[PDB]
Nucleic acid binder design. Structure first.
Lengths: 98, 151, 127, 59, 206, 96, 79
RNA sequence: AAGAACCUUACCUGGUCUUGACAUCCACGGAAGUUUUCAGAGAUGAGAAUGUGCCUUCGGGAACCGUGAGACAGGUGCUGCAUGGCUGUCGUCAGCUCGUGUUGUGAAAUGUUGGGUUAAGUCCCGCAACGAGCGCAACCCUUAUCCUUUGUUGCCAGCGGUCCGGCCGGGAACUCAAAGGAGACUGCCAGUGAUAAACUGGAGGAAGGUGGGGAUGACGUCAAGUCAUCAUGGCCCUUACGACCAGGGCUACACACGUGCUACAAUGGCGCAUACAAAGAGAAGCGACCUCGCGAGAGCAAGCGGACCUCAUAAAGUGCGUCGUAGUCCGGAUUGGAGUCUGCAACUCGACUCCAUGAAGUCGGAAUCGCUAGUAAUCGUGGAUCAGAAUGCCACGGUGAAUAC
């Protein structure tokens, strides 16, 4: 029911963000399912490398925007007032769908 | 190569008749990566030749390759101006390989309307020692014999 | 109960579920000869099973997606070899000699900057 | 809950979501599907949460 | 330009990135503007204070600026007298609440940007570059990190031709990805023109 | 820097909302007929220079009209300058 | 090529056509614009189309049915 | 230059401005703002309107607007033989140096090489050299295999119940998806070699001698390119090499050259039916569905800032019917007539659609290029730039070789 959706820039930041999201709801008492993988988006950027003469040389960069879905099964009174506000994850864009 | 000898990628038998030589035949005859269209024309030409000639499907390409199968090849020994054609006994892989390259090039050269007709005509004319591939085989043997400075 | 094997060929993905029964093969809720068994890749799926002679022993329910005719049949080929553990391992030891137990490492090489494709280089001037 | 009719840019309170005992502002309203797009400024960043009309009250 | 640039590959695997803030791509440009518009300002204001490393993260409703420097005292001031006017204008240019934290770091010579600005300040005061470079590498290797080199280039020695000059103490494995290497650049200016300074410091490995 | 191109572009940004973006839709409905009438002439009196078609995308810092990238709001050498020095979040090298 | 629902005549040039209904035929008018369409209500004008270096005096006739003023202005030069 | 109809645009023909189009500071008065009229191609000059808000110790701020004056600002002006920074290139070929010791009066020499070995200055043996540093492998990413954790917007094997739709209980097994591990380290045996390093074959394993691919290019070289991305010394302009506006040029044509695309065909042309993708992008967006037009497209009009919704129907392939070696139902140039979309506006100089016209071209002289296996070849999809405009650039997959004596 509480369809939490996380969006981060690093693989070792979002699994750790959803680790407390699973522990601070499972321990206090509720029904919780595990994290759904939700495929990572890879955005590529290819730009010319040399400033004034550049015919066939280019530099290639990319960003991997990771995603996660917790999807809390039952919205009990224990998890509603304890889940968020404690992770300090400033680099994770959380989104919640009911 | 320079560092070590390298043999070309080995193949498996064909899916229809189970022969490793027909697999090489359809692979050489293939154009643009379309193996299906290539084997379709090869099987069609083989079937029409086996029906028209009246011989078995095995001898329909075995005797045709046999008449274009060389027994000597040319070595570039540099005697005649940095290139020459000294004759030596052809190895079996090269023996069947040169035969397939010649009969395929002859099928490409033939002026018939359909590739199935160009192939069934070269396959027919080859076995009776009259085809274009037979002319190619019976020209290199003469040039090799004429340039037999060594053996 | 069930004997499972995944299998992949460069773009494709299959689930080969081997259940006891008749010798027919169900692929994508359709028969084998109908989909592509009368055209290209007709007997490549039969090469692992030809060695053990399982003609009417096991039915295969297969769901495959991705790639093309050859890619789907290759995913079915590697799925059957992975799913060949149904009985004792004395039969896959001879299937290894055939070369189908080995997963093919033949996969496409990426395009590179300055090149039209994987290795093709642009034409150089004569002078 | 009272005050069923909402308007954009008005503060509300979260009651059935994970942000209980806190307030927030609704950035966008969808009267057709009756769903509120509310953001909670936690950790210095926006947090889009979906809320229903009857479940929450206007501040 | 054949030499490898370390800061584009070290911050991805072994070191943490200098910009960890997540934002939406659809409004990234304006945010990037507000991000860069104070990094130029902090570079100007902390030129007398000799800044060593800054890490700024913008969650889009507040901005957390973390600063390392030789002396936090001149920047903060007596109880907050100086830092409040900096936080005020940073909060006005970005439009969001600024959190500025200056961390105490002992021996700031192990950072590239500090030594870089130090040599640049010694190139505007017209003193000899060779002695300044030697002391800048000598009293950084003996006090800490296992390797350091400084490659200056451009109108050196008052000559009318381009040249390069460099000292290298210890070892700098620049092509080793696991090596923790700090690298920054600094451009001095004199009557002869702009002088380019590059400093690499290798502390350790993961 | 070439102050001319920057001055013209900044002027067109404000003037492309002062006149355009509100009466342009009226031109789209009336002149390109949707359901000739004489109300079309009154909608062709908009400024020729202030048109969004004249506006060329330029870099935020130097105003370079070539090599620009809309997403990052900079040019390829400016994206490369920030990307190499680790100022763009998560812009790692592509090595697949 | 031309506008779909009607011939686009320039605003200032339309003002010149309205003053030409009252003033009739006159001397060549050196205007700078070239983006005007010809129609039966435009025949008889003696305007001078701009062509960069000079202004070519064009006399409008029936044969210019769908052409614009810019199709009679020599801008480039031949050898 | 990752987008020249105006703009872009720097260049040109005309109309203009001089403390200025941008910035600091001084004085004076005016809220800012939203209105239209005449003239001109516009830049713009010349009038007629409305308003006087927040708020100050009423010195009426803080915002902005107009005028005047000097200091000045401005320049994609010159010089990459005065420079910073960035980049091509030799070349990812295995090279390049520092401490002592020793030799020669000394520049220098040894180390940095003789024998095996590797892609490697990689390792060992030998040994007046002993050690160390940059570089290479090496730590990074993907792919190839398995386990654990994980099941919605994804999936339906063991089960059944119905719209015969994964759609719904359920399973979360698993296609797929993504974090953490394990696995390949000359390790196991035999032979060879010097008993050393190492090599060949076989077993195990999904894969044996850096498994396959990518990133990463040493000390240095060409006074190599960029004063035009930006910064900057010197020099020059300053009622003008500065700034605004309309139009034009950047697209011309007796020519030569480079990089590309389409052809010369029965291996294919036309028409019908039909099977299977991957990688991405998307809010002034992608634009379903419905209706109108043969059509390009227009009006009406859901979903979603994204495994949900869209672009998007994958194409070659495969069945038949047609045409049979012709300048042809091969291939489409050029030209006329009539429209659509974007945009003040298709005007020299745009895209696409309909009708008509059907050049050259019969696989191309001397010569020359790319490729060692998922490669060459061939066929489609997406992205950047983009008001609207690619045969170029970048990226992804289908089928899939030939040949190494």
């Amino acid at each position: 029911r509480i369809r939490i959706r996380l969006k981060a820039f690093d693989h070792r930041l979002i699994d750790q963000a959803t680790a407390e999201i699973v522990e601070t709801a499972k321990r206090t008492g509720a029904q919780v399912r595990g994290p759904i993988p939700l495929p990572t988006r890879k955005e590529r950027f290819t730009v010319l490398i040399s400033p004034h003469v550049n015919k066939d040389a280019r530099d290639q960069y990319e960003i991997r925007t990771h995603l996660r879905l917790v999807d809390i099964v039952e919205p009990t009174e224990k998890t509603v007032d304890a889940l968020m506000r404690l992770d300090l994850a400033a680099g994770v864009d959380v989104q919640i769908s009911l | 190569p320079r560092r070590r000898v390298i043999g070309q990628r080995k193949i498996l038998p064909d899916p229809k008749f189970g022969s490793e030589l027909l697999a090489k035949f359809v692979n050489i005859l293939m154009v643009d990566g379309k193996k299906s269209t290539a084997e379709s024309i090869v099987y069609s030409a083989l079937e029409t030749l086996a029906q028209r000639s009246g011989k078995s499907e095995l001898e329909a390409f075995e005797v045709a390759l046999e008449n274009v199968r060389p027994t000597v090849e040319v070595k570039s020994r540099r005697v005649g101006g940095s290139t020459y054609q000294v004759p030596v006994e052809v190895r079996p892989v090269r023996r069947n390989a040169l035969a397939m390259r010649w009969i395929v090039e002859a099928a490409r050269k033939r002026g018939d309307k359909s590739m199935a007709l160009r192939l069934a005509n070269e396959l027919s004319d080859a076995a009776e020692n009259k085809g274009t591939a037979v002319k190619k085989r019976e020209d290199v043997h003469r040039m090799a014999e004429a340039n037999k400075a060594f053996a | 109960n069930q004997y499972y094997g995944t299998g992949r060929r460069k773009s494709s993905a299959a689930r080969v579920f081997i259940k006891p029964g008749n010798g027919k093969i169900v692929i994508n809720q359709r028969s084998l000869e109908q989909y592509f068994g009368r055209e290209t890749a007709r007997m490549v799926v039969r090469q692992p099973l030809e060695l053990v002679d399982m003609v009417e022993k096991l039915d295969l329910y297969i769901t495959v997606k991705g790639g093309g005719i050859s890619g789907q049949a290759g995913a079915i080929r590697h799925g059957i070899t992975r799913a060949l553990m149904e009985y004792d391992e004395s039969l896959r030891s001879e299937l290894r000699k055939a070369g189908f137990v080995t997963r093919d490492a033949r996969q496409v090489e990426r395009k590179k900057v300055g090149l039209r494709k994987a290795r093709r280089r642009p034409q150089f001037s004569k002078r | 809950r009272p005050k069923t009719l909402f308007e954009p840019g008005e503060m509300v309170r979260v009651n059935d979501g994970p942000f209980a005992d806190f307030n927030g502002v609704v950035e966008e309203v969808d009267y057709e599907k009756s769903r509120l797009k509310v953001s909670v400024s936690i950790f210095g960043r926006a947090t889009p949460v979906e809320l229903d009309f009857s479940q929450v009250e206007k501040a | 330009g054949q030499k490898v640039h370390p800061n584009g590959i070290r911050l991805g695997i072994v070191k943490p990135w200098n910009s960890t803030w997540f934002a939406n791509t659809k409004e990234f440009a304006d945010n990037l503007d507000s991000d860069f518009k104070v990094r130029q300002y902090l570079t100007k204001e902390l030129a007398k204070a000799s800044v060593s490393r800054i890490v700024i993260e913008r969650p889009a409703k507040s901005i957390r600026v973390t600063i390392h420097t030789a002396r936090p005292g001149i920047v903060i001031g007596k109880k907050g007298e100086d830092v409040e006017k900096l936080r005020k204008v940073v909060a006005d240019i970005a439009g969001v609440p600024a959190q500025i934290n200056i961390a105490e770091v002992r021996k700031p010579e192990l950072d590239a940007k500090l030594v870089a600005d130090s040599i640049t300040s010694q190139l505007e005061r017209r003193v000899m570059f060779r002695r300044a470079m030697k002391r800048a590498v000598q009293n950084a290797m003996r006090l800490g990190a296992k390797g350091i080199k400084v490659e200056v280039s451009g109108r050196l020695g008052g000559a009318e031709i381009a040249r390069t000059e460099w000292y290298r103490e210890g070892r700098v494995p620049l092509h080793t990805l696991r090596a923790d290497i700090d690298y920054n650049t600094s451009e001095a200016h004199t009557t002869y023109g702009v002088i380019g300074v590059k400093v690499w410091i290798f502390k350790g490995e993961i | 820097a070439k102050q001319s191109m920057k001055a013209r572009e900044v002027k067109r940004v404000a003037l492309a909302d002062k006149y355009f973006a509100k009466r342009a839709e009226l031109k789209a409905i009336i002149s390109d007929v949707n359901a000739r009438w004489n109300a079309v002439l009154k909608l062709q009196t908009l400024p020729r220079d202030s048109s969004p078609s004249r506006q060329r995308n330029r870099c935020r810092q130097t105003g370079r009209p070539h090599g620009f990238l809309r997403k990052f709001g900079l040019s390829r050498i400016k994206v490369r300058e920030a990307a190499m020095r680790g100022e763009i979040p998560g812009l790692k090298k592509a090595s697949w | 090529r031309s506008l779909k629902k009607g011939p686009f005549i320039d605003l200032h040039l339309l003002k010149k056509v309205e003053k030409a209904v009252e003033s009739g035929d006159k001397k060549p008018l050196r205007t700078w614009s070239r983006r005007s369409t010809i129609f039966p209500n435009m025949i008889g004008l003696t305007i001078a189309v701009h062509n960069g270096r000079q202004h070519v005096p064009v006399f409008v006739t029936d044969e210019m049915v769908g052409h614009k003023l810019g199709e009679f202005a020599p801008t480039r030069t031949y050898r």
